[PDB]
Design a protein around this nucleic acid. Structure first.
Lengths: 108, 98, 37, 133, 110, 78, 149, 213, 99
RNA sequence: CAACGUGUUUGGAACCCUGAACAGACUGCCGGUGAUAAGCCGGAGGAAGGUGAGGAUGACGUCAAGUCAUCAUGCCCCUUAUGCCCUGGGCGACACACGUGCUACAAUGGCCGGGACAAAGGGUCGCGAUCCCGCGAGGGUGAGCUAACCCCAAAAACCCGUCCUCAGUUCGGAUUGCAGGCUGCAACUCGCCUGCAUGAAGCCGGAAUCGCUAGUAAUCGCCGGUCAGCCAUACGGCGGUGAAUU
């Protein structure tokens, strides 16, 4: 969310965040919810990672994105993928369907 | 001339123990002031229930100190030996004052 | 109001004692106002 | 005010939440006394409170007919006035019980369930909850 | 009226009007209704000139308008001198009764 | 009502102010007062990691020592 | 949920009126019932000082000119929002009447609440001020949309 | 989640154990004394019967203080297994219990009683399923074995919950079996329960036995 | 807590009863300043060398486990342990009243 | 409850209260509605009427939710160290962002004076009454109480008078300075409180959003815990006044 958009809030758990990470966050999330015309209040993007070489369990990168919008409720999407980038793109797709669910349900 | 205090956490033990102390004290001697129930020293404690973070939904338990004052009028020697004969009650704390 | 600790209502809120909220009203008081006539 | 009675001839009791009230109802004029004060100066002017005192006697229209000097403590002033009121009702029951039908038909012999609910843990005032966003 | 250096209050009640002066002592405002026995509830209007003389003398008896500005800023040039944590937090305009400054310090963040 | 002094700092006073003047000499125990028989001495105040040399003027009198030595290395582009 | 248990409504403290007791409960703010009592009876002792009729007459005649017979209930059918007017009941019009009367009485400044409630009360008694104008602007909006039902 | 029965029924039908009535600082010190007595008895019988063969099953240790004298009742099911046959078991108990109470040298009577039917007492039966389950025996054989082993010895209703890490697993489970009525909510009902933790080799197990009598 | 900190409170308590009455009865004589006001500053030097015998430094942990926080002082136990010594019929009188 | 004048001195157990047992409320009665039933609507009686009110209570299970920093522990890992002791810091930083509370923005108000009524708690390393010193926080003296006795403890909103009666104000109290007191070896970073000084922002709050169906909401105080003292405007309670709407 570079300008004019919903307020971005990152959470980094078990993960040192970089330039490419949060840059990929605001560009993929923000620039895929850039054709929005939505005054969504708050986006909480909580980007944790787990397992593989870090600890026990498979390599996981798990993102939850929550939108506290005015427009008919709150929404959240959690996806767990092999990379950060596949996580954030996949949640980007899910939140595209949830926001088209909201905009398309405002009809008549 | 003597005041004995009966404190416990249990009502059948003060009821039955004070029952038999009043029984022995009446059947061994003369007129004796009855057990006056003076009120319950009762107090409450709030315990944080879950070990970690759950601030709501706690466990506040309350302890109840029952107590009866009971007064025997005249110190007679076999009556003092009647009361000190009975080391009967199971835990009930008994005290003596004038 | 109630945070105004130089008052009586403020010290009553703060659970403290000073001039305006006295103990033993005979003893301890600020200057007394004299509107007179 | 002096001029005692020192007995329990025709008594009446009453109790709202923390406010108890015992009354004795003497066949007199009407200058009646809460504990040792006048009714006006103890019930602190004329709110509804004094009118709740005047309610059961004006139900039977016995305003001149009696004199009810009252011994009461506990609680605050409104509930103490209510307990005075139901003290008057239970007192009038214990003189002329044929007044059961006017008094009980109105809400004078009953008692409200006015009791302060306790704080419930995780709330603030037994219904008040902290907000969330 | 006009009081000691330049400062003065409106045409209001006398205790409040002395409160309108730059820097008097409010307990000694109450004492200036007691040693002088000035009538406080009466306004600044209807005051005899002997009462104005007594007011100007008793207001000369304690430190006031320009003087306390001078001495407090003397403790501010003192609070330039000797390198203290109060002084270091006044180079950077923090708060020195010590709030937790992780949030909300806007008497000085402005 | 009574000024507080660390007693080894009092022995620093009783060692240098009785024999002869000296230098940077180290102390712990930051909470001590000024004690105007310390003026002109340089006191090394512990700041969390090291000891700082602080010259003691007669203007610095009537406080405690660690007001003079800050503890937080907040350079700060916050 | 089904219903409310019927009602219990007592009369005025010193006049025995079910309307003026409703008004003294509506001027009440957080429990200070002796003070709201004081404001209302200073308003009555004010209204005896302004004109020379019964305060029940100027009060009831005032609230007849505040009470609406119809109002806007912005209802919905099929997702479509009609501003259709539905005829309001009687005691509902009492509560709305002293509602607008009282809140509008909390705007006219200058003096204590006795003068404020007195002034907006006689303005309700003369068709002026703000409460009866509020009746009109909530009345000329439901009149403006009778093309719905 | 669910409240435990011996906590829930304390006003009626269930009595406390540490039955001595005191004052606050003396309450904390009396609780010190109680905990060290239960420590010395538990650790005592665990040592001097760990060298011996079977399980003991000490259910209740009631501690009472009438006068400056402390009645200690021990409710085990198999009390003949304890003593060194003249009375020397309870004598040596009385020695090591005297070792940690002699602030005021007040006498104490350690007694011992029999459980009426030891299978029907959930601490003892929980110790049995603890012992067999600590040996390499499945949940089903041992747990059904505890059930029919119980119902031959006259119990109305029973619930057995065995917690995670059963025979070979890396995912915890819960496995509970019920027979008859076990109404946990009925306050009159007199359910006695136990919650024993089995310390196995490949983890920790949790056994929780409710018995409706 | 850790195994060290219980014995921290233990050895700190031994330093309490080591010269508790001696040092704090000395302070009973220091604060009595009827005789003199200006002097005795050094005698705060004699107040100094008890260090861990300051009763300000002495905590009260839960004796059964050792949590330094939420110790209800009238029982000596912690928060969460106090449930399972109520819920196991162990504390006398704990009638769990929910009035 | 009563007398004596400001006790254990006299009576009484008659009111109140304390606290053990009992009784009571169960659609029990009546009417009417309903396949005769479950019930439903009303009425009487009754202190209370249709779970009387509040609580405790939380099934199988979900989120492989939280807790290996209450405690216990599989496995792994460190072991003249990833262990332990001591002093100083730090958890209290600060361009900002998010959340919960308190104070307010005033005449239903604010101040002063004089009046009035609570409950529930706590306290022998304590609570500390009385008298004196001090504007005060506080200092000394310490009677009484192991608690229905004494103390904390003044309840406050409320009532009656005086002032301001529209202002950034006698609203509001932030921030800072000077001078103190208490606790404690020690109060600077980082405690509370008193006395004076200053008087910031703030004229009821955009988009949005939350709690509550009655002694509730709102509003005013009191107490406890932990505790040497406190960051408590929080938490756990307890009374006072006390609604509107469905």
């Amino acid at each position: 969310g570079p300008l004019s958009s919903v307020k971005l809030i990152l959470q980094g758990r078990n993960l040192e965040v970089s330039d490419n990470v949060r840059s990929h966050v605001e560009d993929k999330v923000g620039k895929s919810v850039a054709k929005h015309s939505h005054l969504v209040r708050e986006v909480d993007v909580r980007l944790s990672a787990r397992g593989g070489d870090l600890s026990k369990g498979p390599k996981l990168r798990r993102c939850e994105v929550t939108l506290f919008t005015k427009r008919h409720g709150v929404i959240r999407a959690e996806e767990d993928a092999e990379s950060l980038y596949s996580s954030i793109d996949l949640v980007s797709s899910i939140i595209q369907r949830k926001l088209r669910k909201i905009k398309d349900k405002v009809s008549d | 001339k003597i005041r004995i205090k009966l404190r416990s956490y249990w009502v059948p033990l003060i009821e039955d123990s004070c029952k038999q102390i009043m029984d022995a004290a009446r059947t061994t001697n003369a007129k004796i002031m009855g057990p006056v129930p003076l009120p319950t020293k009762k107090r409450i404690y709030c315990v944080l229930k879950s070990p970690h973070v759950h601030k709501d939904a706690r466990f506040h338990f309350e302890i109840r100190t029952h107590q009866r004052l009971i007064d025997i009028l005249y110190p007679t020697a076999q009556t003092i030996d009647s009361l000190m004969q009975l080391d009967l009650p199971a835990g009930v704390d008994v005290e003596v004052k004038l | 109001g109630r945070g105004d600790r130089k008052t009586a209502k403020g010290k009553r809120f703060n659970h403290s004692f000073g001039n305006a909220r006295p103990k033993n009203k005979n003893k301890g008081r600020g200057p007394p106002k004299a509107p007179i006539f | 005010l002096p001029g005692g009675f020192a007995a329990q001839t025709v008594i009446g009791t009453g109790r709202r939440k923390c406010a108890i009230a015992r009354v004795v109802l003497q066949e007199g004029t009407g200058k009646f006394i809460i504990n040792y004060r006048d009714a006006k100066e103890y019930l602190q002017g004329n709110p509804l409170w004094l009118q709740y005192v005047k309610t059961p006697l004006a139900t039977l229209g016995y305003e001149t007919n009696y004199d009810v000097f009252v011994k009461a403590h506990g609680g605050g002033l409104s509930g103490q006035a209510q307990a005075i009121s139901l003290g008057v009702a239970r007192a009038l029951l214990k003189v002329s019980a044929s007044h059961r039908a006017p008094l009980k038909q109105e809400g004078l012999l009953t008692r409200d369930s006015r009791i302060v609910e306790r704080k419930k843990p995780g709330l603030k005032k037994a219904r008040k909850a902290p907000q969330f966003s | 009226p006009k009081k000691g250096g330049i400062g003065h209050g409106g045409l209001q009640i006398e205790c409040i009007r002395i409160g309108g002066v730059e820097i008097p002592n409010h307990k000694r405002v109450e004492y200036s209704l007691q040693y002088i026995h000035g009538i406080g509830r009466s306004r600044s209007r209807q005051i005899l000139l002997d009462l104005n003389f007594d007011n100007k003398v008793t207001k000369d008896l304690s430190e006031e308008e320009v003087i306390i500005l001078r001495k407090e800023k003397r403790f501010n040039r003192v609070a330039i001198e000797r390198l203290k944590e109060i002084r270091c937090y006044r180079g950077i305009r923090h708060k020195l009764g010590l709030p937790v400054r992780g949030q909300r310090t806007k008497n000085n963040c402005r | 009502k009574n000024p507080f002094v660390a007693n080894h700092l009092l022995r620093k006073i009783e060692k240098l102010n009785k024999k002869a003047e000296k230098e940077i000499i180290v102390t712990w125990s930051r909470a001590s007062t000024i004690i105007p028989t310390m003026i002109g001495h340089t006191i090394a105040i512990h700041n969390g990691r090291e000891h700082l040399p602080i010259y003691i003027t007669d203007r610095m009198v009537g406080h405690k020592l660690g007001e003079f030595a800050p503890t937080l290395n907040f350079r700060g582009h916050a | 949920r089904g219903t409310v248990e019927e009602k219990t409504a007592k009369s005025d403290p010193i006049y025995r009126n079910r309307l003026v007791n409703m008004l003294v409960n509506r001027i009440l703010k957080h429990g200070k019932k002796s003070l709201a009592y004081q404001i209302l009876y200073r308003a009555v002792k004010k209204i005896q000082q302004k004109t020379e009729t019964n305060p029940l007459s100027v009060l009831r005649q005032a609230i007849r000119g505040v009470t609406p017979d119809i109002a806007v209930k912005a209802r919905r059918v099929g997702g479509s929002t009609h501003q259709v007017p539905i005829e309001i009941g009687s005691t509902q019009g009492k509560a709305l009447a002293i509602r607008w009367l009282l809140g509008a009485a909390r705007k006219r400044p200058g003096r204590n609440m006795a003068f404020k409630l007195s002034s907006e009360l006689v303005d309700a008694a003369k068709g002026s001020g703000d409460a009866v104008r509020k009746k009109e602007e909530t009345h000329r909006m439901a009149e403006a949309n009778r093309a719905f039902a | 989640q669910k409240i435990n029965p011996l906590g829930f029924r304390l006003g009626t039908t269930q009595s406390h154990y540490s039955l001595w009535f005191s004052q606050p600082k003396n309450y904390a010190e009396g609780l010190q004394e109680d905990q060290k007595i239960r420590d010395c008895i538990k650790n005592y019988v665990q040592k001097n019967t760990k060298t011996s063969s079977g399980v003991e099953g000490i259910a209740r240790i009631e501690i009472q203080k009438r006068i400056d004298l402390i009645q200690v009742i021990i409710h085990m099911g198999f009390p003949k297994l304890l003593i060194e046959n003249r009375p020397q078991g309870v004598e040596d108990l009385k020695i090591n219990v005297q070792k940690e109470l002699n602030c005021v040298n007040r006498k104490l009577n350690i007694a011992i009683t029999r459980i009426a039917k030891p299978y029907g007492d959930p601490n003892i039966l929980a110790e049995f399923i603890a012992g067999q389950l600590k040996s390499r025996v499945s949940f089903r054989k041992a747990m059904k074995k505890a059930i029919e082993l119980t119902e031959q010895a006259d119990t109305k209703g029973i619930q057995i919950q065995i917690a995670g890490r059963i025979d070979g697993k890396e995912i915890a489970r819960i496995e509970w079996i019920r027979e008859g009525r076990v109404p946990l909510q009925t306050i009159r009902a007199k359910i006695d329960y136990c919650a024993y933790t089995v310390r196995t080799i490949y983890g920790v197990l949790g056994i929780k036995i409710w018995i409706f009598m | 807590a850790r195994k060290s900190l219980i014995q921290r409170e233990k050895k700190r308590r031994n330093l309490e009863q080591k010269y508790h009455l001696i040092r704090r009865s000395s302070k009973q004589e220091i604060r009595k300043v009827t005789s003199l006001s200006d002097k005795w500053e050094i005698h705060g030097k004699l107040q100094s060398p008890p260090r861990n015998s300051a009763p300000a430094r002495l905590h009260r942990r839960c004796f059964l486990t050792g949590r330094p926080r939420a110790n209800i002082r009238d029982f000596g136990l912690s928060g969460h342990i106090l449930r399972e010594m109520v819920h196991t019929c162990l504390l006398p009188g704990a009638t769990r009243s929910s009035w």
